[PDB]
Design a binder for these strands. Structure first.
Ligand SMILES: Nc1ncnc2c1ncn2[C@@H]1O[C@H](COP(=O)(O)OP(=O)(O)NP(=O)(O)O)[C@@H](O)[C@H]1O
Ligand SMILES: Nc1ncnc2c1ncn2[C@@H]1O[C@H](COP(=O)(O)OP(=O)(O)NP(=O)(O)O)[C@@H](O)[C@H]1O
Ligand SMILES: [Mg+2]
Ligand SMILES: [Mg+2]
Lengths: 239, 251
RNA sequence: GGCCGCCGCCACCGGGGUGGUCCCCGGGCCGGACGAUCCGGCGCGCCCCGAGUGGGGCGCGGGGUUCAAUUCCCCGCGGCGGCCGCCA
RNA sequence: GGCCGCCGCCACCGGGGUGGUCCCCGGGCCGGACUAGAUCCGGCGCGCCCCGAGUGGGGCGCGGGGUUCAAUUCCCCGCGGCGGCCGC
């Protein structure tokens, strides 16, 4: 069967590169897989503007959503907030597909390094900040626990990852009358105990009086709430 | 004014993507919200190509353009080899009553092969030659397919001029749904007088076997009569038609 | 490219009407008498008279019905919508 | 990361309800009835104590404290399990 693979990690950690390589190995193992991320649409605009984010976010989600109907989808996005990963998981749940969160990690050193090597189009200060605010996968919710944690400073074994993911895709993602009688007879008993201030010994009789009464009732086939309750009220009035 | 759909068309390696980015940049400096979209966005998200992904690719790409045109100028960076493809892109713009301009980019087979080689010949040169050979320039069969601009991408391109021309055109009223404006009509009484005076004129022409000359006077006699009547406020159909019959009788 | 539905082929543009040589409503422009207003008009082609660069005549894809076709009928070309085919 | 919360601590398991000494629902298992069946009847955990020392019977308790005539329920603390919204 097929699944939703959710990457998470800071800008420059290697999400996009890891995505392409993962997809390529999967393709060799005979799987139809597509790589999606908010960046596809975000970079389609010639400049950045806060006001495009809504459309960017909505459109990326529609593509992911429509793609998971027929293909494995690798979501290549920073996904720094747990609520963002929750949102992606809701798509998998909706289609009853399995999902795996893959957390790519790297020291802040490497991150700043790589960011400089890219023209620091994202200011290093913002990178530092994001590293601090990042939501550690699984620290808050079991559903957020990373299927794998990848160290992008060391070599990566895609065949092994593929193998594990393929196995995971084969798992099963699972994700009147009577009570009325009990409820109400309980109310009546409390009403009665109040109106007569019975003693410790006489209340116990009333309790037992109700147990015996209820037990007898669950024996008869035809039972009408209102009529049974009336029978109970008068049983107490003459006891 | 408002926003429009810019449709690019031209063979692989002609420079569509490069032209797209530059045009999008200039438009942006000119205060326009524009996005660049093409089937490649989705096609290259797959690690391999398979003909069965194409339906999805097409469905996905059109949905994006469609939803984006509600809010932004859309530049479509796709080969758009066939007119029916450009037609489908126009129907999106008609769906939202937005202007559109087909921009046709060309270059000699000479440059296309060279550039195709410099790209590792992912597309066999043979295919490039053939595509180039069978390609029908836009506008050769349909008027709605006539390019707004034809750009030689081997020559210098002036993006400010183009941007300028594009902005002007966005400020025009599309000839899409000006075909449903069923109004500016006269009240039933007026139209009833037009219709009836027309039949009376015909009845009269018959009863007196007029010649081409004498008929023209009757026609002008009707024109002058209706003109005068639409100047009065209170008009009774039956009364007016009698006045017209008599006007003809003492002619 | 094929099938079906519908519309255009009256001529500044849009819409509408119509067996009257077109007409109506809104928009545009030109001319004229008087500058608003009012009155006349508007494309293309062929011919003719004129001699000055104007006036007039015939025509508007083909054919039919008819005194008369923009209108009705058959065919041709084109538009729009629907459905199929095409789509390195 | 912030704010908040749900579930269990009634006792085969899971879900639900409930100030009445617990109950309802689904599943499971044990014993009996049953010319493999199904249905019907009875029942189910841990701890300490007692008669018997019989694969038997009875008693009391169910993390601690509080409100109570009565707590599975409600408040507070404890242990174990899990989530929501928002941070965009
Ligand atoms: N596994 C790796 N080891 C070392 N360098 C890497 C590795 N993966 C990627 N890089 C380099 O790190 C830089 C950024 O890689 P990239 O995959 O674009 O990160 P990203 O997380 O997708 N970035 P962003 O899209 O901005 O969040 C480039 O120089 C990559 O070549
Ligand atoms: N105006 C230009 N002058 C010189 N080279 C150009 C020009 N435009 C594009 N190129 C180059 O031609 C090659 C392809 O350009 P590109 O804009 O990607 O063409 P394309 O039509 O988008 N190709 P494709 O996506 O395969 O249909 C690259 O080397 C471009 O830099
Ligand atoms: Mg990336
Ligand atoms: Mg391109």
């Amino acid at each position: 069967h097929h699944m939703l693979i959710i990457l998470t990690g800071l800008p420059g950690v290697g999400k996009s590169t890891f995505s392409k390589n993962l997809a390529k190995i999967l393709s060799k193992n005979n799987i139809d897989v597509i790589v999606l991320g908010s960046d596809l649409i975000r970079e389609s605009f010639p400049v950045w503007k806060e006001k495009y984010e809504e459309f960017i976010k909505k459109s990326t989600y529609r593509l992911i959503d429509s793609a998971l109907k027929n293909y494995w989808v690798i979501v290549d996005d920073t996904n720094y907030y747990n609520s963002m990963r929750r949102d992606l998981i809701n798509i998998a749940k909706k289609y009853n597909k399995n999902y795996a969160i893959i957390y790519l990690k790297a020291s802040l050193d490497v991150l700043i390094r790589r960011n400089i090597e890219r023209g620091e189009k994202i200011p290093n200060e913002v990178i530092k900040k994001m590293y601090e605010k990042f939501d550690e996968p699984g620290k808050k919710y079991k559903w957020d626990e990373p299927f794998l944690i990848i160290d992008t400073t060391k070599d990566i074994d895609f065949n092994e990852i593929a193998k594990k993911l393929i196995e995971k895709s084969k798992e099963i993602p699972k994700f009147n009358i009577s009570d009325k009688i009990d409820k109400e007879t309980r109310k009546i008993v409390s009403e009665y105990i109040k109106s007569k201030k019975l003693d410790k010994d006489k209340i116990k009789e009333v309790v037992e009086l109700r147990k015996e009464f209820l037990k007898k009732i669950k024996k008869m086939e035809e039972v009408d709430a209102d009529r049974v309750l009336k029978e109970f009220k008068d049983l107490l009035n003459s006891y």
